[PDB]
Design a protein around this ligand. Structure first.
Ligand SMILES: CC[C@H](Sc1nc2c(N)ncnc2[nH]1)C(=O)O
Ligand SMILES: CC[C@H](Sc1nc2c(N)ncnc2[nH]1)C(=O)O
Lengths: 166, 163
């Protein structure tokens, strides 16, 4: 029956979680749904300085070693520096080769998927939208001058909603 | 007030406060408590499982032939599940000799069993809590109703998430 605004609805959420009519964690989830439109990917991304990239001409042995030591399943791919990103590569794709012979035989370029670039200030709501309807759940966050601000994956948006898992 | 929140959420759609997409996701959040895992699980007949005594070379061959990253690991029949195996752990293992010399049991994680009737909300609670990613749905007799993963619940909140 009643009529309410976004601010009033967030207040009723706080007042029905201090009420016990809903769980603290169901509150935090629905609240998180609401804050997605106000979060820029910048606030949730992995920034350039902490990310693990690899060069297109490296070998698939090199990718395997990178997975073993930093444990990141999916890895951006650059040519000259990290500001010239040429695609993305997934460690599980190694399994289709998984031959101590074949791996040193091919370059990461041979398994690199085309890259998805979002501007540094897109909101998590739009990014969830864009990522869900795409086979690559990982976008490159780009700064205002064309450089690589960082990287952002769907599981990060997911965690924003639900919380940390894995 | 639980019915009150249920109703003012739809009202908040009507007062322009939230998009129908946001209200759809929030109705999904609310309807997690009322959805049983049977409604979302993959059942035995659609399932891909592997013996614990098989070799990691066998695991890899399975993965090639079927593309499933998570595999329930069973002992005698698929009604006696003893864990889950993750293809990614295969990447940690020496192509030549380490796969013919090790078996699936070396990499299986202990399983998580949920009743067939359990709701999604409690499933999500217990998965986030135990920090597992896949559970084995049992039937009232001990058999295997199917398997269910976190991304099932997630998509049940936010929509199909196509790899
Ligand atoms: C799924 C994530 S992938 C991931 N890739 C990263 C990278 N290249 N740099 C920094 N953090 C990263 N996380 C996982 O399995 O960890
Ligand atoms: C997105 C995550 C899924 S997990 C999965 N494992 C399964 C199995 N053993 N049998 C039937 N269906 C399954 N789904 C994937 O990696 O494709």
């Amino acid at each position: 029956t009643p009529l309410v605004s976004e601010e009033e609805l967030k207040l009723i959420l706080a007042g029905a979680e201090e009420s016990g009519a809903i769980q603290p964690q169901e509150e935090e989830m629905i609240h998180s749904i609401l804050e997605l439109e106000e979060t820029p990917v910048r606030e949730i991304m992995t920034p350039r300085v902490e990310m693990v990239a690899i060069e297109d001409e490296a070998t698939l042995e090199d990718l395997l070693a990178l997975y073993r030591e930093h444990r990141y399943s999916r890895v951006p791919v650059y040519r000259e520096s990290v500001d010239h990103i040429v695609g993305v590569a997934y460690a599980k794709d190694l399994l289709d080769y998984y031959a101590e012979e074949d791996l040193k035989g091919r370059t990461v370029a041979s398994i690199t998927h085309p890259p998805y670039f979002v501007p540094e200030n897109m909101d998590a709501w739009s990014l969830l939208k864009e990522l869900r309807r795409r086979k690559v759940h990982m976008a490159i966050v780009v700064d205002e001058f064309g450089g690589t601000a960082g990287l952002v994956i769907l599981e990060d948006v997911i965690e924003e909603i639900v919380g940390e898992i894995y």
